[PDB]
Amino acid sequence: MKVRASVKKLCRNCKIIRRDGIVRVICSAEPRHKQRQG
Amino acid sequence: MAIKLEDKKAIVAEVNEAAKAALSAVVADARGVTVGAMTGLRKEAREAGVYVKVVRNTLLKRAVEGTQFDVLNDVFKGPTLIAFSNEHPGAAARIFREFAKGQDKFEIKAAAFEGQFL
Amino acid sequence: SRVAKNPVKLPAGVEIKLAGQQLSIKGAKGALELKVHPSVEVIQDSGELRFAARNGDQQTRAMAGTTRALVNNMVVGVSQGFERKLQLVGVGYKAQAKGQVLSLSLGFSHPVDYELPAGIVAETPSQTDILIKGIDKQLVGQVAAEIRDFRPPEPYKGKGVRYADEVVRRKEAKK
Amino acid sequence: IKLQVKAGQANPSPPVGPALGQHGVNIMEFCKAFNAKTQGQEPGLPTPVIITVYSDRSFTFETKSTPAAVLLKKAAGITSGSARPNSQKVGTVTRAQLEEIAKTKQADLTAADLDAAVRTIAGSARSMGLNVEG
RNA sequence: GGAGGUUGGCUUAGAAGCAGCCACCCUUUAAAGAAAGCGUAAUAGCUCACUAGUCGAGUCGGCCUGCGCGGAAGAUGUAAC
RNA sequence: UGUCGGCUCAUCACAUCCUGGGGCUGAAGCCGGUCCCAAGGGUAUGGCUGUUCGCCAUUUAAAGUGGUACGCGAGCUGGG
Numbered sequence: 250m251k252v253r254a255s256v257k258k259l260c261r262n263c264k265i266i267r268r269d270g271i272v273r274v275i276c277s278a279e280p281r282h283k284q285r286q287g
Numbered sequence: 288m289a290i291k292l293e294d295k296k297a298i299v300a301e302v303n304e305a306a307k308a309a310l311s312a313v314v315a316d317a318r319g320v321t322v323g324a325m326t327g328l329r330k331e332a333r334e335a336g337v338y339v340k341v342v343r344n345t346l347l348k349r350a351v352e353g354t355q356f357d358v359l360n361d362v363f364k365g366p367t368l369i370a371f372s373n374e375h376p377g378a379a380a381r382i383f384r385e386f387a388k389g390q391d392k393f394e395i396k397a398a399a400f401e402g403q404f405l
Numbered sequence: 406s407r408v409a410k411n412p413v414k415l416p417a418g419v420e421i422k423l424a425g426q427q428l429s430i431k432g433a434k435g436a437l438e439l440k441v442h443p444s445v446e447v448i449q450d451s452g453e454l455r456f457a458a459r460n461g462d463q464q465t466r467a468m469a470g471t472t473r474a475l476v477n478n479m480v481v482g483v484s485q486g487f488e489r490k491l492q493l494v495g496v497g498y499k500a501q502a503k504g505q506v507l508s509l510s511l512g513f514s515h516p517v518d519y520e521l522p523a524g525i526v527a528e529t530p531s532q533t534d535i536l537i538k539g540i541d542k543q544l545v546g547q548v549a550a551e552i553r554d555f556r557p558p559e560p561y562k563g564k565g566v567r568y569a570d571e572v573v574r575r576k577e578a579k580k
Numbered sequence: 581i582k583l584q585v586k587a588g589q590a591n592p593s594p595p596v597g598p599a600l601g602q603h604g605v606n607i608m609e610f611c612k613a614f615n616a617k618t619q620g621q622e623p624g625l626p627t628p629v630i631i632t633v634y635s636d637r638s639f640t641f642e643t644k645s646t647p648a649a650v651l652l653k654k655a656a657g658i659t660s661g662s663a664r665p666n667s668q669k670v671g672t673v674t675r676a677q678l679e680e681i682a683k684t685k686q687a688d689l690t691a692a693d694l695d696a697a698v699r700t701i702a703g704s705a706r707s708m709g710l711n712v713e714g
Numbered sequence: 715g716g717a718g719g720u721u722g723g724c725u726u727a728g729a730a731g732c733a734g735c736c737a738c739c740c741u742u743u744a745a746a747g748a749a750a751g752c753g754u755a756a757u758a759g760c761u762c763a764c765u766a767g768u769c770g771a772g773u774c775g776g777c778c779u780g781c782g783c784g785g786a787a788g789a790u791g792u793a794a795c
Numbered sequence: 796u797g798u799c800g801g802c803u804c805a806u807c808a809c810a811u812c813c814u815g816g817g818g819c820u821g822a823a824g825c826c827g828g829u830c831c832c833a834a835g836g837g838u839a840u841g842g843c844u845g846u847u848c849g850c851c852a853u854u855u856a857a858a859g860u861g862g863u864a865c866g867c868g869a870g871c872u873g874g875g
């Protein structure tokens with residue numbers, strides 16, 4: 250998990266989701282594209 | 288995607304223009320053929336005479352207004368491999384026997400030798 | 406709402422009872438599928454089952470597609486038993502089904518015994534295959550996910566319990 | 581299994597990267613067909629012929645008469661192409677050597693119908709300088 | 715389905731649409747860039763872009779603006795109505 | 796309104812040094828790096844120097860960073 254103030258898509262498989270008041274990025278290709286906050 | 292101006296309203300007429308020159312037409316479900324296998328088939332329309340092509344199903348059903356193969360309205364569904372045979376009336380369905388001999392494909396929906404619903 | 410407007414189209418032998426918002430479905434090889442719908446939901450009975458929203462609220466629109474999915478799961482469940490497939494990868498990894506207890510060998514000092522909750526039953530056609538099989542998806546999927554969490558797959562050898570349809574990421578140590 | 585075999589000699593593995601590959605075709609097996617691949621099979625040049633397996637490690641060989649650049653080099657005699665396109669030229673001929681080259685080269689390896697291979701044959705040398713007007 | 719000229723050339727042992735620099739055609743058609751991504755030592759191999767059928771009514775993105783969300787860690791005790 | 800350091804006795808924060816729970820890794824294993832959660836309890840002895848610090852020697856799971864009149868002389872000392 251990467252926690253930044255600026256979270257965004259890094260590839261075509263990344264998704265932006267809002268999960269209990271927090272913006273997150275979940276990717277099904279690279280586990281390095283997981284993000285939190287922002 | 289073809290727009291209604293550049294195409295999709297002209298290529299519908301061209302096959303209708305070429306519709307009123309043929310005696311036979313074999314429609315086959317040509318789905319799953321390799322590019323070479325089609326090319327091998329496509330290196331036969333220039334030899335024995337055929338107008339083989341693929342077009343939109345809705346356009347094809349609107350391309351029979353010239354009363355050439357009206358009996359195919361009820362079969363204008365699924366994949367299309369229209370094979371108009373203008374020169375040497377027929378002679379393409381025989382190639383279809385040769386075409387489908389080595390393939391599991393080419394179910395061949397119907398043949399339109401003159402007015403005839405297969 | 407494409408999901409909501411879709412009717413259920415119940416099969417031949419299924420019994421449906423509607424005592425208000427509460428609903429109960431009976432079927433073969435399992436029955437007693439009890440559910441309650443939120444007050445914003447209308448379940449109208451006909452030759453099939455249809456679902457529609459009372460209010461115009463955005464949350465009421467969301468729950469219309471949830472009820473349709475939930476009811477369709479009960480109908481399929483009491484007609485076809487839902488199932489999940491797990492397989493074990495690794496040397497010495499075995500699964501044995503013994504009634505309502507499941508024993509797994511996953512490389513620990515102690516064998517692990519897993520107790521299956523009532524309802525579902527587990528079957529092991531091979532020593533490296535597990536069949537979880539029940540009538541409601543949530544219980545079938547929760548149990549399969551609990552077994553998988555004993556030792557989930559790892560990227561270097563692929564060892565560990567996995568879903569049959571699961572794609573496991575693989576990597577190698579560099580140089 | 582796309583591969584290449586040296587005309588008249590199949591023993592050299594590093595020349596073709598033999599053994600390891602898609603299949604397990606024997607290195608010494610192709611030596612027999614190498615005799616058939618001579619004189620009229622690009623002698624002295626590495627003609628690429630793909631391979632196939634019937635049951636296990638077959639010797640299914642192919643034949644490529646003359647590639648476009650192989651034909652273009654044969655028809656022109658130049659040593660190399662242009663590193664910078666539209667900057668350097670080497671010299672070309674009329675669009676008449678292409679007709680006889682394409683007729684020999686296409687045969688069944690091209691789907692061109694009539695004067696269609698002229699564009700395809702000129703396509704390989706289109707970006708290699710030597711502008712042609714007639 | 716998603717191709718052949720075509721391991722584009724230069725160099726590189728070799729670097730083959732995917733080591734770096736030049737511009738980036740044409741046949742078949744329903745489609746295809748001298749090729750967008752992960753890839754091989756280099757090949758090979760999974761895709762993608764584009765198109766045919768399928769299901770049958772909406773769907774896609776940008777601009778202006780109101781109110782909110784994250785960014786937001788301190789010391790005696792809630793303790794920034 | 797007595798100003799450095801030492802002794803004695805502390806109390807709080809968390810921006811966590813150890814122990815506890817996790818994600819990613821250019822994570823094979825044993826070791827690590829980085830970030831997230833967590834303040835319950837722990838968290839050296841000496842040689843030199845008035846020293847706080849610092850450098851050395853040998854330990855330890857670890858030898859945290861700060862606030863409290865740079866905590867504490869109507870509690871001690873008096874080397875600066």
Ligand SMILES: [Mg+2]
Nearest residue numbers: 268269270271
């Ligand atoms: Mg939670």
Ligand SMILES: [Mg+2]
Nearest residue numbers: 782783784785
């Ligand atoms: Mg704010």
Ligand SMILES: [Mg+2]
Nearest residue numbers: 788789808809
């Ligand atoms: Mg606080």
Ligand SMILES: [Mg+2]
Nearest residue numbers: 788789793794
């Ligand atoms: Mg505060």
Ligand SMILES: [Mg+2]
Nearest residue numbers: 789790791793
């Ligand atoms: Mg305070």
Ligand SMILES: [Mg+2]
Nearest residue numbers: 791792793808
């Ligand atoms: Mg507090």
Ligand SMILES: [Mg+2]
Nearest residue numbers: 792793794795
């Ligand atoms: Mg107040």
Ligand SMILES: [Mg+2]
Nearest residue numbers: 792793794795
């Ligand atoms: Mg008040």
Ligand SMILES: [Mg+2]
Nearest residue numbers: 789790791807
């Ligand atoms: Mg406090």
Ligand SMILES: [Mg+2]
Nearest residue numbers: 809811832833
């Ligand atoms: Mg913290």
Ligand SMILES: [Mg+2]
Nearest residue numbers: 811812813859
């Ligand atoms: Mg710590």
Ligand SMILES: [Mg+2]
Nearest residue numbers: 817818829830
């Ligand atoms: Mg860690």
Ligand SMILES: [Mg+2]
Nearest residue numbers: 252810829830
């Ligand atoms: Mg930090």
Ligand SMILES: [Mg+2]
Nearest residue numbers: 811834835836
């Ligand atoms: Mg603590």
Ligand SMILES: [Mg+2]
Nearest residue numbers: 834836837838
């Ligand atoms: Mg503490």
Ligand SMILES: [Mg+2]
Nearest residue numbers: 807834835836
């Ligand atoms: Mg405490």
